[model samples]
Target: GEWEIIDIGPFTQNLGKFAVDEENKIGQYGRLTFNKVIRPCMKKTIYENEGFREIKGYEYQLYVYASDKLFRADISEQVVAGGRKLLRFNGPVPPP
Candidate 1:
């Protein structure tokens, strides 16, 4: 099913308390938070007899701080944004 964005609130992603753990490690960044944080509301799938319905939930959120880095000489890499990972691609292919 397709849904439309009805409304939204003003919010910002902050990354003030996180930093690279060791600069050379794959999981280099870390975040600290004491409580559960809320970021945004999104349409969720609700299964039904016909098809589905869009619902709002607090699952889509961003924590305290986020960090990120490009592909390094390490084995694998994971990207961090707004204290959460937005994308992660693994690689270490063999040479022909």
Candidate 2:
């Protein structure tokens, strides 16, 4: 499956309520939203033959404010090429 860009929003305004939680942690910076169609990974499989239509879902991620120390000591130090890091959530995200 491949990801497709649906929309991107600036931090100026809140699109969905997710911004509220972002603002609480740190001031809003920017956000990215993309979607990937739901399909079987294997082609020429029985699942494909079932005529499973594609489904769309959006992914939202926002850039929040972080202290210089946190960025430099925590994030920057661990960033690999392309400046991406993995974050594992202990549980579901809390409501704003």
Candidate 3:
């Protein structure tokens, strides 16, 4: 997150949804950049925070679980993260 280019992506994720397929390139580029650079750095951060780190598989699990939790605040809580409630929704909610 300390990286300038890396932190700029969260905004682009929103931009992609409104843009055409090609305009989505910004999202792709941001993800690619994160994957190539930021992702590896995250693993290191995870290790620094705790002995166990998130590898690719674990990272994805976190993403899916976190996504669910964020989208559906009314659903059951996430069991893995200390009773963090899971958000449940019937349809895909538009991002902010």
Candidate 4:
């Protein structure tokens, strides 16, 4: 599936309290957290089925400091939205 955009913020502010996973050189400024801290903040999507009922799947996005870089060849050497992202999408994002 495509990457979800749950929320983005400083890693330390969110997960720094736990030392089990801290910003390390191996990860190279990238960190992932799930099945825990992000539940409350995950993005919710509601849909209708043939039964005329509502279905909601709380999809997970991602966590990254706003300071990080998303280097894409197409968007290379460029800056966006005072320096942000390059893509957008809509509801019920399908799986890969």
Q: lDDT per model, in order? A: 0.25, 0.24, 0.23, 0.28
Q: Report the error of model 3 at residue 16, Å.
A: 19
TM-score of each: 0.20, 0.24, 0.16, 0.23
Q: Give each model's clash number.
A: 1, 0, 6, 2
Query: Model 1 lDDT vs. the true structure?
Result: 0.25
Best by TM-score: 2
Clash pairs, candidate 2, are none
Worst 10 residues of 1 by lDDT: 69-78
Worst lDDT 10-window in candidate 4 = 71-80
> Between 1 and 3, whose TM-score is larger?
1
Better of 2 and 3 by lDDT: 2
Task: Please list the residue runs of candidate 4 whose C-alpha ends up more than 4 Å from where it truly belongs after superposition.
Answer: 1-48, 66-96
Q: Candidate 3 clashing pairs? A: 72-87, 72-88, 73-87, 76-86, 77-85, 77-86
In lDDT terms, how accurate is model 3? 0.23
**Positional deviation of residue 51's Cα in model 2 after best superposition, in angstroms:** 3.0
The residue-by-residue lDDT of candidate 3 on 1-96, one tens digit each, is: 011122324533322222222222434222221111111111111123444643211111111112232121122223264342222222123332
> What is the TM-score of candidate 1?
0.20
Q: What digit string (tens of lDDT, one per residue) describes model 2 on residues 16-72?
A: 223333333442323323212111111111112234553222222332222211110
Write one digit per residue (lDDT tens) for candidate 4, span 61-92: 32222223221111101122222221221222
Best model per lDDT: 4
